[PDB]
Scaffold this motif. Structure first.
Motif, PDB file in Angstrom:
ATOM      1  N   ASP A  11       0.841  -1.185   0.000  1.00 43.88           N
ATOM      2  CA  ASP A  11       0.000   0.000   0.000  1.00 43.88           C
ATOM      3  C   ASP A  11       0.885   1.248   0.000  1.00 43.88           C
ATOM      4  O   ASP A  11       1.207   1.786   1.058  1.00 43.88           O
ATOM      5  N   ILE A  12       1.254   1.672  -1.201  1.00 46.46           N
ATOM      6  CA  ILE A  12       2.096   2.847  -1.353  1.00 46.46           C
ATOM      7  C   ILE A  12       1.275   4.101  -1.046  1.00 46.46           C
ATOM      8  O   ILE A  12       0.767   4.753  -1.957  1.00 46.46           O
ATOM      9  N   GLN A  13       1.171   4.400   0.240  1.00 40.86           N
ATOM     10  CA  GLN A  13       0.421   5.564   0.679  1.00 40.86           C
ATOM     11  C   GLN A  13       1.374   6.709   1.029  1.00 40.86           C
ATOM     12  O   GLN A  13       1.770   6.860   2.185  1.00 40.86           O
ATOM     13  N   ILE A  14       1.714   7.486   0.011  1.00 41.41           N
ATOM     14  CA  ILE A  14       2.612   8.612   0.198  1.00 41.41           C
ATOM     15  C   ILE A  14       1.892   9.903  -0.194  1.00 41.41           C
ATOM     16  O   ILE A  14       1.844  10.259  -1.372  1.00 41.41           O
ATOM     17  N   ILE A  15       1.350  10.571   0.814  1.00 43.47           N
ATOM     18  CA  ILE A  15       0.634  11.816   0.590  1.00 43.47           C
ATOM     19  C   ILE A  15       1.616  12.883   0.103  1.00 43.47           C
ATOM     20  O   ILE A  15       2.781  12.885   0.499  1.00 43.47           O
ATOM     21  N   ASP A  16       1.110  13.764  -0.747  1.00 37.18           N
ATOM     22  CA  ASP A  16       1.930  14.835  -1.291  1.00 37.18           C
ATOM     23  C   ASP A  16       1.118  15.614  -2.328  1.00 37.18           C
ATOM     24  O   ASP A  16       0.132  15.107  -2.859  1.00 37.18           O
ATOM     25  N   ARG A  17       1.564  16.835  -2.585  1.00 38.83           N
ATOM     26  CA  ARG A  17       0.892  17.689  -3.548  1.00 38.83           C
ATOM     27  C   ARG A  17       0.534  16.894  -4.805  1.00 38.83           C
ATOM     28  O   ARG A  17       1.345  16.115  -5.304  1.00 38.83           O
ATOM     29  N   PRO A  18      -0.715  17.122  -5.293  1.00 42.71           N
ATOM     30  CA  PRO A  18      -1.191  16.435  -6.482  1.00 42.71           C
ATOM     31  C   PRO A  18      -0.552  17.018  -7.744  1.00 42.71           C
ATOM     32  O   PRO A  18      -0.390  18.231  -7.858  1.00 42.71           O
ATOM     33  N   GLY A  19      -0.210  16.126  -8.662  1.00 45.42           N
ATOM     34  CA  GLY A  19       0.408  16.536  -9.911  1.00 45.42           C
ATOM     35  C   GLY A  19      -0.634  17.114 -10.872  1.00 45.42           C
ATOM     36  O   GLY A  19      -1.825  17.133 -10.565  1.00 45.42           O
ATOM     37  N   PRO A  20      -0.133  17.581 -12.047  1.00 38.81           N
ATOM     38  CA  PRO A  20      -1.007  18.158 -13.056  1.00 38.81           C
ATOM     39  C   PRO A  20      -1.796  17.069 -13.785  1.00 38.81           C
ATOM     40  O   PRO A  20      -1.545  15.880 -13.591  1.00 38.81           O
ATOM     41  N   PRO A  21      -2.759  17.525 -14.631  1.00 39.23           N
ATOM     42  CA  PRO A  21      -3.585  16.603 -15.391  1.00 39.23           C
ATOM     43  C   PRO A  21      -2.801  15.995 -16.555  1.00 39.23           C
ATOM     44  O   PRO A  21      -1.914  16.638 -17.113  1.00 39.23           O
ATOM     45  N   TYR A  88      -5.394  31.818 -22.858  1.00 36.98           N
ATOM     46  CA  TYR A  88      -4.826  30.574 -22.368  1.00 36.98           C
ATOM     47  C   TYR A  88      -5.686  29.981 -21.250  1.00 36.98           C
ATOM     48  O   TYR A  88      -6.645  30.607 -20.802  1.00 36.98           O
ATOM     49  N   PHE A  89      -5.311  28.782 -20.832  1.00 33.97           N
ATOM     50  CA  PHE A  89      -6.036  28.096 -19.775  1.00 33.97           C
ATOM     51  C   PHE A  89      -5.192  26.973 -19.170  1.00 33.97           C
ATOM     52  O   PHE A  89      -4.443  26.303 -19.881  1.00 33.97           O
ATOM     53  N   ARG A  90      -5.343  26.800 -17.865  1.00 34.80           N
ATOM     54  CA  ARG A  90      -4.604  25.768 -17.156  1.00 34.80           C
ATOM     55  C   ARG A  90      -5.504  25.085 -16.126  1.00 34.80           C
ATOM     56  O   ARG A  90      -6.278  25.747 -15.437  1.00 34.80           O
ATOM     57  N   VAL A  91      -5.370  23.768 -16.051  1.00 32.42           N
ATOM     58  CA  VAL A  91      -6.162  22.988 -15.115  1.00 32.42           C
ATOM     59  C   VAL A  91      -5.270  22.529 -13.959  1.00 32.42           C
ATOM     60  O   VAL A  91      -4.195  21.974 -14.182  1.00 32.42           O
ATOM     61  N   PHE A  92      -5.749  22.778 -12.750  1.00 31.26           N
ATOM     62  CA  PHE A  92      -5.010  22.398 -11.559  1.00 31.26           C
ATOM     63  C   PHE A  92      -5.594  21.132 -10.931  1.00 31.26           C
ATOM     64  O   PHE A  92      -6.616  20.622 -11.390  1.00 31.26           O
ATOM     65  N   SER A  93      -4.919  20.658  -9.893  1.00 33.70           N
ATOM     66  CA  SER A  93      -5.360  19.459  -9.199  1.00 33.70           C
ATOM     67  C   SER A  93      -5.477  19.737  -7.699  1.00 33.70           C
ATOM     68  O   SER A  93      -4.513  20.167  -7.066  1.00 33.70           O
ATOM     69  N   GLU A  94      -6.666  19.480  -7.173  1.00 27.53           N
ATOM     70  CA  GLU A  94      -6.921  19.696  -5.759  1.00 27.53           C
ATOM     71  C   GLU A  94      -7.337  18.386  -5.089  1.00 27.53           C
ATOM     72  O   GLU A  94      -7.428  17.350  -5.744  1.00 27.53           O
ATOM     73  N   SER A 100      -2.196  22.182  -7.625  1.00 26.68           N
ATOM     74  CA  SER A 100      -1.026  21.566  -8.228  1.00 26.68           C
ATOM     75  C   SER A 100       0.019  22.635  -8.555  1.00 26.68           C
ATOM     76  O   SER A 100      -0.304  23.661  -9.153  1.00 26.68           O
ATOM     77  N   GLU A 101       1.249  22.360  -8.148  1.00 26.09           N
ATOM     78  CA  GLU A 101       2.343  23.285  -8.389  1.00 26.09           C
ATOM     79  C   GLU A 101       2.411  23.649  -9.874  1.00 26.09           C
ATOM     80  O   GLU A 101       2.598  24.813 -10.223  1.00 26.09           O
ATOM     81  N   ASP A 102       2.259  22.630 -10.708  1.00 25.29           N
ATOM     82  CA  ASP A 102       2.302  22.828 -12.148  1.00 25.29           C
ATOM     83  C   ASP A 102       0.912  22.571 -12.735  1.00 25.29           C
ATOM     84  O   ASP A 102       0.134  21.797 -12.180  1.00 25.29           O
ATOM     85  N   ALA A 103       0.644  23.234 -13.849  1.00 25.83           N
ATOM     86  CA  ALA A 103      -0.638  23.086 -14.518  1.00 25.83           C
ATOM     87  C   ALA A 103      -0.404  22.824 -16.006  1.00 25.83           C
ATOM     88  O   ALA A 103       0.438  23.468 -16.629  1.00 25.83           O
TER      89      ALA A 103
END
Length: 120
Positions: A11-21, A88-94, A100-103
């Motif tokens: 069970d690789i449960q490593i919480i951390d900021r979500p990446g981009p789409p 332009y447009f960018r989608v984030f991850s919550e 998300s740091e990057d979009a």
């Protein structure tokens, strides 16, 4: 063909900021509205992807203004668009961490215009 895959004991449960789409495209653009289309994450294993924050900006001030937060669907129709210009447009991850740091910015911009080509 026919095949499957199942078997694991970890069970690789490593919480951390979500990446981009995976990717971000534009369904289309008509009148004064834009259609965005982003794909889901390949991770989806930590915090139920609450939603995805969208941000639109013009090629004048390149200012990003929160369009929508804590969304649900993977597509949202933008509004308040001036015909005869690009944006332009960018989608984030919550989820819990934050945005998300990057979009994933649309490989290209959406040209506003009172038209629509059914290329699909």
């Amino acid at each position: 063909g026919s095949s499957g895959s199942s078997g694991a004991s970890i069970d690789i449960q490593i919480i951390d900021r979500p990446g981009p789409p995976q990717i971000v495209k534009i369904e289309d653009v008509w009148g004064e509205n834009v259609a965005l289309t982003w794909t889901p994450p390949k991770d989806d294993g930590n915090a139920a992807i609450t939603g995805y924050t969208i941000q639109k900006a013009d090629k004048k001030s390149m200012e990003w203004f929160t369009v929508i937060e804590h969304y649900h669907r993977t597509s949202a129709t933008i509004t308040e668009l001036v015909i005869g210009n690009e944006y332009y447009f960018r989608v984030f991850s919550e989820n819990m961490c934050g945005l998300s740091e990057d979009a994933t910015m649309t490989k290209e911009s959406a040209v506003i215009a009172r038209d629509g080509k059914i290329y699909k």
